[PDB]
Design a protein around this ligand. Structure first.
Ligand SMILES: CCCCCCCCCCCCCCCCCC(=O)OC[C@H](CO[C@@H]1O[C@H](CO[C@H]2O[C@H](CO)[C@H](O)[C@H](O)[C@H]2O)[C@H](O)[C@H](O)[C@H]1O)OC(=O)CCCCCCCCCCCCCCCCC
Ligand code: CLA
Ligand code: CLA
Ligand code: CLA
Ligand code: CLA
Ligand SMILES: CCCCCCCCCCCCCCCC(=O)OC[C@H](CO[C@@H]1O[C@H](CS(=O)(=O)O)[C@@H](O)[C@H](O)[C@H]1O)OC(=O)CCCCCCCCCCCCCCC
Ligand SMILES: CC1=C(/C=C/C(C)=C/C=C/C(C)=C/C=C/C=C(C)/C=C/C=C(C)/C=C/C2=C(C)CCCC2(C)C)C(C)(C)CCC1
Ligand SMILES: CC1=C(/C=C/C(C)=C/C=C/C(C)=C/C=C/C=C(C)/C=C/C=C(C)/C=C/C2=C(C)CCCC2(C)C)C(C)(C)CCC1
Ligand SMILES: CC1=C(/C=C/C(C)=C/C=C/C(C)=C/C=C/C=C(C)/C=C/C=C(C)/C=C/C2=C(C)CCCC2(C)C)C(C)(C)CCC1
Ligand SMILES: CC1=C(/C=C/C(C)=C/C=C/C(C)=C/C=C/C=C(C)/C=C/C=C(C)/C=C/C2=C(C)CCCC2(C)C)C(C)(C)CCC1
Ligand SMILES: CCCCCCCCCCCCO[C@@H]1O[C@H](CO)[C@@H](O[C@H]2O[C@H](CO)[C@@H](O)[C@H](O)[C@H]2O)[C@H](O)[C@H]1O
Ligand SMILES: CCCCCCCCCCCCO[C@@H]1O[C@H](CO)[C@@H](O[C@H]2O[C@H](CO)[C@@H](O)[C@H](O)[C@H]2O)[C@H](O)[C@H]1O
Ligand SMILES: CCCCCCCS[C@@H]1O[C@H](CO)[C@@H](O)[C@H](O)[C@H]1O
Ligand code: OEX
Ligand SMILES: [Cl-]
Lengths: 62, 451, 34, 29, 81, 37, 334, 38, 341
């Protein structure tokens, strides 16, 4: 269960970094806005999901 | 790239955000992103504080300013302000930090991706600064939001654990507020008190019932006012009194925030009710008084009659009269006799400090507290060497009251300056000479000479 | 089209060379322990 | 004390990196 | 202009950085070693932390004679055994 | 201290509060990239 | 037009030898009251118990002072921050003993000078000018606030406000250095950069413009007659002045733009002095100068003094001697 | 003292009112250019 | 067109950094003074002259490093590297404070160099030499404080040491020992510096707020051309504004700028005169009438007597460490102190 927690949190941090760099780059990029838009939706959903998972798993490792 | 150089916008890079004045979408972006910054610092700073937090050390020995704010709200602490559970601090931090991602997301979106102006997109979200109706409407929305916030404080205090009450009988403790002060005579009574010594205006509020009732009042007032400004448009006298432009509104708000900053400076410097000394350390007055107390206790233990001890000047060495007769601590701390604190008040009688109580009723916890506060007075250096300016290095300490007071004086000052700047400019721009004097129509040249 | 070793060049380096050396030294000093 | 410096290096580069990527891709700077 | 190459040109040129990505670190490291090897102490006569006082001494080695000051300092240094 | 589980992120936590400052500096990097036009 | 309308027109008239204005409506009586009370007190006020220990200090000329030693003495430490107007005293004699004049004067003055700033905005508006001269004035004004109001608030007594006199000013400075090590405070250092720099640039600008005056006069007349008030032509050659200064240092160190240059001239001392004011205003809450007392230590642990420690010894002299009968307990906590 | 206090209170109120009503009396319009600022 | 004239040609070439004949004096001396200060503050102690650490190498910071004056026992020795004290030994020379005289002297000649530069460039460009003339005040200050003052005293030791905190100490010493704030020449100095600052501020702000609209930009700096004939701001409006605000106003621009030269230059010159007095302990220390009254009357108190008590504290509490060559031992019981503190 702890493995799941640290997995999800490391994932959350990484994804956060990726989004931090990628979202403004995408927003200001001329080309490939459709796939980028899709990926921002995806990354956002996954980001919210990971926050909820880390949030729940918190109470099973602390 | 609309309006993103000096030639097209009229504004140089160093005034680049002035290019945003009539671009409501991008401006929305800037604001939501900034709110994101604020929330971000709240959360991040909280987590930083918590990581650096040793629970058995006083908060104020550890350079904390946010955890004290959380603790004052009743979260995480018990009798005497002892930390009994850090998890609420953790929650406050994490949740602010998570929320800042959302705000930053919306901000970046509106700022470099969304509609640059909102007016063609939405009549609801669009606005013209000169549209007094819309402006008072948005003002109304936000007033309602503020009222809701104040009511959240009320609800915390009355229905969700209560608040930390430094004045609680038997010692400081978290207490549920059940009978908030609703009497307007008291509430606005605070508003009509002198700001000078022994009065202190609203800064003098000294019980949680008054605080809670005040926020009930402020909440209703803000919601009512908000509805009012949604449903109305400025009256004629108002129209003729004000400048109606973005920069003007900004200037008004800057004035407001300058005022609030000064008020907060004084609040954290003098008040020990909503800034409990358990968490923030003793006030200046408090520590000075505490020194007097400490040596009265020491010398009286040694056999001194502190009531009759004449000091070198002829005034009492330990005890003297205030200009209106109350018995007060002697020495320089004569200036601080308006101080009131849970550790000192049991020695106070109707005529001030009571000699019999002083002789017979001083408890060990009072000695302790006076010693603690005397030795954590809000004095210290910029590199956080605690004590008077001549003290040697050894104690790593600057009071949170000092940090907060100084920071907010600096900010309030520069915000007053900003108010003068943007008010003067808004006037000049509205009248149309912010860019300089028209050579062919120089006003003074049409005026009679002074002599 | 432009010279390399000018009066300006000399001036610049009489300041810049010692400055970088000195900064190296002060850097080293930060790890000195009594 | 290594991880603090590594982290601030990653974050601290994250900023200029966006600008650089956009400048390269001739984006809307 | 006064005939020299613009600094903007120079510092943004590739060659400039080929040169100085060597020469600047070299200088920096040289100064670093000037301290870390202890040479600085001896060039300038600056006390190391253990050379301000002999073990039980508590009197500053103040120079008090103008013309035999040099010998006084030398004596003071010998006094650190 | 943070809950034990999160302790591995202590260095990261030490660095976070300064990030807002970086944004200010970023504004300048950005302006330099468009020549302060 | 009705009486009130006429009155408004006069108040805000651009044709009055001295502009009145609405800020002036407050400014004029408060400055008059502060001035009159100040002159009378400086000449004739009896000794004042500044430190509340029944040890009255003589400030006025008739009571043994000259121009250099004289002062209007701050109100009693017994008063602290209490409001002490004339009608709070049992008598004028009590009022004078307790330093009432000081409070009357500094409050009327702070109000009046604030309104002076406002009035600078106001006339700039009436004349069709740009508005920020008042922002420049905010710097000396903020300083005044710092030493007459904010520092007293922070320390809990107007007895610690700057005295209205020359020697009293020096007293305030020395005690300030004792209790805050202000010399080692970066905001005071920025203030020094502000006024030293202001003086430098004042002299520099003065000399550069004077150096490039265009010849319009003979050697037997003042060059000043070569300028006529309201002439449209600039009276000096800024290209020549820039040629000079740009060559004095190097070209890109010098301003070719007069607007840019004059903005610099405004900004440097104003910002510096803003920081001086903020320095006083924050040492008001005892966030003090850098303390490097005993910061250097040898291998055994012997203290190796630096110049900071010598400063510390001087400050100690000031601390132990100041207000020599006022302290009964070992720490000076305000 | 009470007469003095009443007197000063009346005075201060007088001037303060002059200030407020003064600035309420169409002040934006009191400039040399654009007067229509309502 | 012989070698002298060829050399003159080269010296006066219009390069990025102008050289000139004056450059031959200026650049080596300025370079050696700056370099000496940096060398000393980075690497050099003051143990043997003051009993002080004073370098980054020893652990001092920017505020506390200094190149300190020589020991009092050196008197006013030029303290040349090849002189009878150091005798050619670079290390001993550093230990004896050689860098202090090195910096003060190369600095003095550098200042001469710089003012000569001002004359030379003014002459070459065709302007009046008022900038050099104004620079005479920095000269007077440097020469009175770093040369005349210690020459009047026992030795170079009591000159200011070249460092931030060291200078702060110089200030406090002058208060405690000279009562320098009481000196009317210092007061004139203060009036000139603060008045200079005031003029700088007010003139800059006035020009910036009486600008003609000479462009369409809301940022108004671009609407100026160095070559333009017209005044860029309105002197008439400025004059009316200040006439109605302050009662009086400049009406003459030439007088305005000359005055801006005059105030701070004169102020600094006066302060110089005061320091020349302090070289001989010729102080404005006391008012004799004050002292006669106060000696006879133990209830007579003014801010003047208060400040003297402060001075007495400074002297007693700072002298033993500040003046180590005197070997002062002041037993606790003789230290002046008020109650409790
Ligand atoms: C539109 C605006 C128009 C304004 C027009 C002018 C109207 C008057 C303005 C007054 C200005 C300041 C007056 C004195 C302020 C002061 O002594 O402030 C102190 C008071 C607080 O007073 C203290 O309040 C204390 C209350 O604490 C008490 O209650 C507590 C309860 O916990 C504790 O128990 C405590 O121990 C106990 O003593 C005590 O009563 C003290 O005796 C008392 O001195 O602050 C306060 O009331 C409120 C804070 C006021 C703001 C501070 C002023 C800052 C101005 C800076 C301007 C710079 C301008 C630069 C221009 C360029
Ligand atoms: C809180 C500070 C702040 C904020 C919120 C803004 C916001 C804005 N500025 Mg201003 N500005 C600022 C400070 C700020 N500025 C400072 C300090 C200066 C002086 C250097 C300026 C000088 C300036 C000028 C001269 C101009 C602006 C402009 C703008 C607007 C458009 C920016 C743009 O299109 O660039 C495009 C930039 C990029 C494409 C690079 C990437 C930018 C994004 C925002 C980076 C996001 C990083 C972040 C970590 C991502 C998180 C993602 C995650 C949430 C998933 C925008 C609303 C412009 C304007 O008004 O246009 C109408 C304009 O011309 N600014
Ligand atoms: C309301 C503002 C505020 C206040 C009262 C505090 C107070 C404190 N902080 Mg916090 N903090 C803040 C904002 C604040 N901080 C911000 C914005 C950040 C992100 C940078 C942080 C991140 C942070 C960290 C990482 C730490 C603290 C710590 C502390 C404590 C020690 C402070 C210290 O030594 O400062 C040193 C003093 C300075 C650096 C001087 C600052 C002077 C500024 C630059 C002058 C600015 C003037 C003006 C704004 C400029 C305008 C220009 C003008 C021309 C207009 C103290 C309780 C320490 C602690 O003990 O935590 C437990 C600690 O480790 N803070
Ligand atoms: C806070 C200020 C604010 C304002 C005035 C706006 C306004 C707008 N946004 Mg923006 N936005 C914001 C913040 C804001 N947003 C934030 C925080 C995010 C990140 C989630 C975004 C991300 C975003 C995207 C991706 C888009 C917009 C769009 C829009 C436009 C359409 C709005 C609409 O029809 O929603 C309809 C309203 C609802 C569906 C109801 C909302 C229910 C709320 C969220 C419940 C919570 C309420 C509570 C008060 C929240 C408190 C938060 C506080 C504590 C911080 C409108 C101009 C659209 C646009 O610009 O199209 C061109 C669009 O595509 N926004
Ligand atoms: C964010 C807060 C806020 C803001 C910016 C506004 C703004 C406005 N209000 Mg609104 N209002 C608000 C909240 C707010 N309101 C709330 C919460 C309520 C319910 C209480 C109201 C109830 C209300 C009514 C009934 C009216 C307004 C009106 C107005 C307009 C003119 C007001 C004016 O001239 O003020 C300037 C203030 C004055 C002229 C008051 C007299 C001046 C004295 C000297 C002020 C002295 C105060 C002193 C310095 C403060 C110290 C503390 C004090 C208690 C001692 C303006 C758009 C007017 C309007 O046009 O409505 C359409 C109007 O008739 N408001
Ligand atoms: C510590 C001991 C001190 C003792 C004194 C020993 C040194 C004496 C002081 C010397 C100070 C100046 C030396 C450098 C001069 C220089 O760089 O000239 C550069 C010249 C000419 O370059 C030319 O330079 C010209 C530009 S400019 O002159 O630099 O402005 C340009 O016109 C031309 O094309 C280009 O070829 O090249 C040289 O021959 C330098 C000779 C060696 C020095
Ligand atoms: C517009 C603009 C700008 C600005 C911008 C901004 C200001 C932005 C912001 C943004 C933001 C504001 C963002 C934010 C973000 C956040 C995030 C991304 C977060 C994340 C988090 C996390 C991931 C967490 C984690 C954790 C947990 C959960 C638990 C505990 C621990 C830890 C912490 C690890 C500029 C100036 C540049 C310029 C251009 C324009
Ligand atoms: C919460 C709380 C409380 C309460 C509070 C309250 C209740 C408050 C209120 C408040 C208020 C009730 C406020 C008000 C304010 C106001 C103001 C601040 C005003 C302003 C005005 C102005 C600014 C104007 C101006 C002008 C003039 C003067 C002239 C004409 C023109 C114009 C308009 C410009 C208490 C303390 C109990 C306790 C604690 C808690
Ligand atoms: C919370 C969190 C997070 C977030 C993060 C962030 C949000 C970041 C951002 C970041 C950033 C936002 C960064 C930035 C940076 C910047 C910089 C680093 C800059 C610098 C600058 C400079 C250095 C400048 C320079 C200059 C120029 C450019 C021009 C002018 C001159 C001068 C020199 C000033 C993550 C994801 C980790 C995950 C975990 C948690
Ligand atoms: C003495 C002598 C000599 C000389 C030598 C020399 C000449 C040297 C030089 C040296 C040098 C030449 C050095 C330099 C150094 C530099 C440095 C060490 C720097 C540092 C810097 C910094 C630290 C920076 C800072 C800052 C500022 C300033 C502002 C902005 C920001 C910042 C913070 C970045 C001879 C041999 C003849 C002989 C014997 C004696
Ligand atoms: C653009 C700016 C670039 C700046 C680059 C800065 C690079 C900094 C690298 C840090 C490396 C630290 O490496 C450090 O080296 C020094 C030796 O010199 C060691 O220090 C050692 O020497 C000193 C004396 O010189 C002893 O008093 C100390 O007790 C001992 O540990 C440290 O044990 C080691 O931690
Ligand atoms: C304690 C502070 C007092 C707070 C009082 C708050 C009152 C709120 C309502 C104020 C009503 C304002 O009423 C204001 O006064 C008079 C009324 O004849 C008018 O009178 C003015 O009109 C024009 C306006 O261009 C002026 O040129 C003229 O000098 C004057 O007669 C103002 O134009 C009007 O707007
Ligand atoms: C110092 C100045 C001395 C100049 S010396 C001068 O130089 C000429 C060539 O330049 C010779 O022809 C001439 O005879 C000689 O006197
Ligand atoms: O009063 Mn004026 O001086 Ca401010 O510290 Mn405490 O108190 Mn007093 O002694 Mn130090
Ligand atoms: Cl005391």
């Amino acid at each position: 269960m702890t493995i799941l927690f640290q997995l999800a949190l490391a994932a959350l941090v990484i994804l956060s970094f990726v989004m931090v760099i990628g979202v403004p780059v995408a927003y200001a990029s001329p080309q490939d806005w459709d796939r980028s838009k899709q990926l921002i939706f995806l990354g956002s959903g996954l980001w919210i999901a990971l926050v909820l998972v880390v949030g729940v798993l918190n109470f099973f490792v602390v | 790239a609309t309006n993103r150089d000096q030639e097209s916008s009229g504004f140089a890079w160093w005034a680049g955000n002035a290019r945003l004045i009539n671009l409501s979408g991008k401006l929305l972006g800037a604001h939501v992103a900034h709110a994101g910054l604020i929330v971000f610092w709240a959360g991040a700073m909280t987590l930083f504080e918590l990581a650096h937090f040793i629970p058995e050390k006083p908060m104020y020995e550890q350079g904390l300013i946010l955890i004290p704010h959380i603790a004052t709200l009743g979260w995480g602490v018990g009798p005497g302000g002892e930390v009994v559970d850090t998890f609420p601090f953790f929650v406050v931090g994490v949740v602010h930090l998570i929320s800042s991602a959302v705000l930053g997301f919306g901000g970046v979106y509106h700022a470099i991706r969304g509609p640059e102006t909102l007016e063609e997109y939405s009549s609801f979200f669009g606005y013209d600064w000169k549209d007094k109706n819309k402006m008072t409407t948005i003002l109304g929305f936000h007033l309602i939001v503020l009222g809701i916030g104040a009511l959240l404080l009320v609800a915390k205090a009355m229905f969700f654990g209560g608040l930390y009450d430094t004045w609680a009988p038997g010692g400081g403790d978290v207490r549920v507020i059940t009978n908030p002060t609703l009497d307007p005579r008291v509430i606005f009574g605070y508003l009509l008190k002198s700001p000078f010594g022994g009065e202190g205006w609203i800064v003098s509020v000294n019980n949680l019932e008054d605080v809670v009732g005040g926020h009930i009042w402020i909440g209703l007032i803000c919601i009512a006012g908000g509805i009012w400004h949604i449903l109305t448009t400025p009256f004629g006298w108002a129209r003729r009194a004000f400048i109606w432009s973005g920069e003007a509104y900004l200037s008004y708000s800057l004035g407001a925030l300058s005022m609030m900053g000064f008020i907060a400076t004084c609040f954290v410097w003098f008040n020990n009710t909503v800034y409990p000394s358990e968490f923030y350390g003793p006030t200046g007055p408090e520590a000075s008084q505490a020194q007097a107390m400490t040596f009265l206790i020491r010398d009286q233990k040694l056999g001194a009659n502190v009531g009759s001890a004449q000091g070198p000047t002829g005034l009492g060495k330990y005890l003297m009269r205030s200009p209106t007769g109350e018995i007060i601590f002697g020495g320089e701390t004569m200036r601080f006799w308006d101080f009131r604190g849970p550790w000192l008040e049991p020695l106070r009688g109707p005529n001030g400090l009571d000699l019999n109580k002083i002789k017979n009723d001083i408890q060990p916890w009072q000695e302790r507290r006076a010693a603690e506060y005397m030795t954590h007075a809000p004095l210290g250096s910029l590199n956080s060497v605690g004590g008077v300016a001549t003290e040697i290095n050894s104690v790593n300490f600057v009071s949170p009251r000092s940090w907060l007071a100084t920071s907010h004086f600096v900010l309030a000052f520069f915000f007053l300056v900003g108010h003068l700047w943007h008010a003067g400019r808004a006037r000049a721009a509205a009248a149309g000479f912010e860019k300089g004097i028209d050579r062919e129509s120089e006003p003074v040249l049409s005026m009679p000479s002074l002599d | 089209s432009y010279p390399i070793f000018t009066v300006r060049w000399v001036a610049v380096h009489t300041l810049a060379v010692p400055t970088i050396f000195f900064l190296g030294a002060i850097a080293a000093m930060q790890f000195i322990q009594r | 004390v290594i991880a603090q410096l590594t982290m601030i290096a990653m974050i601290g580069i994250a900023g200029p990196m966006i600008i650089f990527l956009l400048a390269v891709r001739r984006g809307n700077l | 202009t006064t005939g020299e190459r613009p600094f903007s040109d120079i510092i943004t040129s590739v060659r400039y950085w080929v040169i100085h990505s060597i020469t600047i670190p070299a200088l920096f490291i040289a100064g670093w070693l000037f301290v870390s090897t202890g040479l600085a102490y001896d060039v300038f006569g600056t006390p190391r932390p253990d050379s301000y006082y002999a073990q039980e001494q508590r009197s500053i080695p103040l120079v008090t004679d103008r013309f035999e000051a040099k010998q006084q300092v030398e004596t003071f240094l010998e006094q650190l055994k | 201290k943070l809950p034990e589980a999160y302790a591995i992120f202590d260095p990261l936590v030490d660095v976070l509060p300064v990030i807002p400052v970086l944004f200010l500096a970023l504004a300048f990097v950005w302006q330099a990239a468009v020549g302060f036009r | 037009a009705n009486l009130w309308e006429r009155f408004c027109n006069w108040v805000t008239s651009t044709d009055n030898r001295l502009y009145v204005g609405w800020f002036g409506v407050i400014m004029i009586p408060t400055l008059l009251a502060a001035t009159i009370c100040f002159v009378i007190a400086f000449i004739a006020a009896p000794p004042v118990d500044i430190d509340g220990i029944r040890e009255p200090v003589s400030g006025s000329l008739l009571y043994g002072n000259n121009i250099i030693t004289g002062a209007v003495v701050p109100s009693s430490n017994a008063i602290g921050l209490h409001f002490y107007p004339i009608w709070e005293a049992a008598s004028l004699d009590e009022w004078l003993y307790n330093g009432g004049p000081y409070q009357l004067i500094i409050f009327h003055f702070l109000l009046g000078a604030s309104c002076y700033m406002g009035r600078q905005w106001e006339l700039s508006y009436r004349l069709g000018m740009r508005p920020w001269i008042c922002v420049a004035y905010s710097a000396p004004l903020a300083s005044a606030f710092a030493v007459f109001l904010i520092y007293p608030i922070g320390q809990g007594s107007f007895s610690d406000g700057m005295p209205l006199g020359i020697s009293g000013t020096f007293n305030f400075m020395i005690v300030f250095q004792a209790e805050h090590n202000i010399l080692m405070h970066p905001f005071h250092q920025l203030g020094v950069a502000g006024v030293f720099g202001g003086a430098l640039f004042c002299a520099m600008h003065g000399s550069l413009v004077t150096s490039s005056l265009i010849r319009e006069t003979t050697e037997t007349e003042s060059a000043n007659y070569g300028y006529k008030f309201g002439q449209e032509e600039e009276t000096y050659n800024i290209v020549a002045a820039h040629g000079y200064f740009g060559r004095l240092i190097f070209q890109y160190a010098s301003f070719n733009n007069s607007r840019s240059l004059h903005f610099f001239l405004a900004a440097w001392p104003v910002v510096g002095v803003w920081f001086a004011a903020l320095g006083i205003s924050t040492m008001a809450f005892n966030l003090n100068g850098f303390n490097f007392n005993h910061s250097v230590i040898d291998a055994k642990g012997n203290v190796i003094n630096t110049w900071a420690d010598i400063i510390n010894r001087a400050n100690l002299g000031m601390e132990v001697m100041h207000e020599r009968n006022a302290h009964n307990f070992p720490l000076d906590l305000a | 003292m009470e007469t003095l206090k009443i007197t000063v209170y009346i005075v201060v109120t007088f001037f303060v009112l002059l200030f407020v009503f003064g600035f309420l009396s169409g002040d934006p319009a009191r400039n040399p250019k654009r007067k229509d600022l309502e | 067109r012989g070698w002298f004239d060829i050399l003159d040609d080269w010296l006066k070439r219009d390069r990025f950094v102008f050289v000139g004949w004056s450059g031959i004096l200026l650049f080596p001396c300025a370079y050696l003074a700056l370099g000496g200060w940096l060398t000393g503050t980075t690497f050099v102690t003051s143990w043997y002259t003051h009993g002080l650490a004073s370098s980054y190498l020893e652990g001092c910071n920017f505020l506390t490093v200094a190149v300190s004056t020589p020991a009092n026992s050196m008197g006013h020795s030029l303290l040349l590297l090849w002189g009878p004290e150091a005798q050619g030994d670079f290390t001993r020379w550093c230990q004896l404070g050689g860098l202090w005289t090195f910096i003060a002297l190369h600095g003095a000649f550098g200042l001469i160099g710089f003012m000569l530069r001002q004359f030379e460039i003014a002459r070459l460009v065709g302007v009046r030499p008022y900038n050099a003339i104004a620079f005479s005040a920095p000269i007077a200050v440097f020469v009175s404080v770093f040369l005349i003052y210690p020459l009047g005293q026992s030795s170079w030791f009591f000159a200011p040491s070249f460092g931030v905190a060291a200078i702060f100490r110089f200030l406090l010493f002058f208060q405690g020992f000279h009562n320098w704030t009481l000196n009317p020449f210092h007061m004139m100095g203060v009036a000139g510096v603060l008045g200079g600052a005031l003029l700088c501020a007010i003139h800059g702000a006035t020009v910036e707020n009486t600008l003609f609209q000479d462009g369409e930009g809301a940022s108004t700096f671009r609407a100026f051309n160095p070559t333009q004939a017209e005044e860029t701001y309105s002197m008439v409006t400025a004059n009316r504004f200040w006439s109605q605000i302050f009662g009086i106003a400049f009406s003459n621009k030439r007088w305005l700028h000359f005055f801006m030269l005059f105030v701070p230059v004169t102020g600094l010159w006066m302060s110089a005169i005061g320091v020349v007095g302090l070289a001989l302990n010729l102080r404005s220390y006391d008012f004799i009438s004050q002292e006669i009254r106060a000696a006879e009357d133990p209830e007579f108190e003014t801010f003047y007597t208060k400040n003297l008590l402060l001075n007495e504290g400074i002297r007693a509490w700072m002298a033993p460490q500040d003046q180590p060559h005197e070997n002062f031992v002041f037993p606790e019981e003789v230290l002046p102190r008020g109650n409790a503190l």
